[PDB]
C-alpha cells in the first residue's frame, strides 16, 4: 500500500509536478575488488564506502524532499495511512 | 546456494560465517519519519539525518563485504570463478 492511498486526480497531477522537481556501477566494481581478494583490506573498504558520499547525499536529499512534498498534498485520512505504512516498514 | 557446486561442508562453513559477523537494534529512523511528515521540509535537519545514517551504512557495508570476502576464500579456484561471474549479474 506504500503507494495505495486513494489518490485524487489533482494529487496524481501534483505528484507529477513533484517528481519533475526531483528526477552505482563503478562502485559495485570497487566492492567486487575488495571482496575477491585473499585478505580483507578494511582501510580500502572504508575508502570505497566513502567515495560516493556526496552523490549519495544529493540522492537521499531529493528523495526525502520528494516524500515530504507528497506527504503534504495528502488529506488527514491519507496522512494517517501513509504514517501507519511508514511504521510497518 | 547459487549453482556454485558448493559442497555440503562449504554449505555449513558459510552458515558459521554469516552468523559470525552477525554479532554486530540498528538505528532510529523515527528521525526520518519526522522529517518527511512535517509541514515544511528542513534541508539542514535532513542533511543531518543522512550523515547519521552514513555511519550505520558504513557498519553494514563493512560487515557485508567482510562476510562475502570470507565466503570467497573458502571456495576453490573454479568456484571463485563462478562466484565472480555470478557477482556480475546482480
Ligand atoms: Cl562488479
Ligand atoms: Cl518510524
Ligand atoms: Zn480521473
Ligand atoms: Zn561510468
Ligand atoms: Zn565485478
Ligand atoms: Zn574492478
Ligand atoms: Zn595474497
Ligand atoms: Zn575503521
Ligand atoms: Zn566524507
Ligand atoms: Zn557534504
Ligand atoms: Zn528544492
Ligand atoms: Zn519521531
Ligand atoms: Zn531547521
Ligand atoms: Zn573481522
Residue numbers in the entry:
A (entry chain A): 28 to 50, 57 to 122
B (entry chain B): 29 to 52, 57 to 122
From the reporting publication:
Spy is one of a group of chaperones that allow clients to fold while remaining continuously bound to the surface of the chaperone. We have previously observed that the chaperone substrate Im7 exists in a heterogeneous, largely disordered crystallographic ensemble while bound to the chaperone Spy. To refine strategies for detecting anomalous scattering for observing partially occupied disordered states, we co-crystallized the tight-binding Spy H96L variant with short peptides derived from its client, Im7. These peptides each had a single iodophenylalanine substitution at position 18, 19 or 20.
(i) The height of the ANODE anomalous peak is the second largest observed in this study and, at 26.4σ in the phased anomalous difference Fourier map, is substantially larger than the signals observed from zinc, chlorine and methionine sulfur, the largest of which is 9.3σ. (ii) The position of this anomalous signal is structurally inconsistent with expected zinc- or chlorine-binding residues, which would be required to enable binding with a suffciently high occupancy to produce a strong anomalous signal. Thus, although the 4.5 keV data set was not analyzed for this crystal, the strength of the signal and its chemical environment are inconsistent with it being derived from zinc or chloride, making it likely that the anomalous signal is owing to the iodine in the Im7 peptide. The larger peak heights for L18pI-Phe and K20pI-Phe, compared with each of the L19pI-Phe peaks, suggest a higher level of occupancy at these positions. Attempts to perform traditional model building using the residual L18pI-Phe and K20pI-Phe peptide density were unsuccessful owing to the weak nature of the electron density, as well as its somewhat amorphous shape, which is likely to be owing to multiple conformations within the peptide. Of note, the electron density for the L18pI-Phe and K20pI-Phe mutants has a substantially more defined shape and signal strength than that observed previously in other mutants. In the case of L18pI-Phe, the molecular-dynamics simulation used to generate the conformational pool was found to not sample positions encompassing the iodine position in the crystal, preventing any fitting and further analysis of this signal.
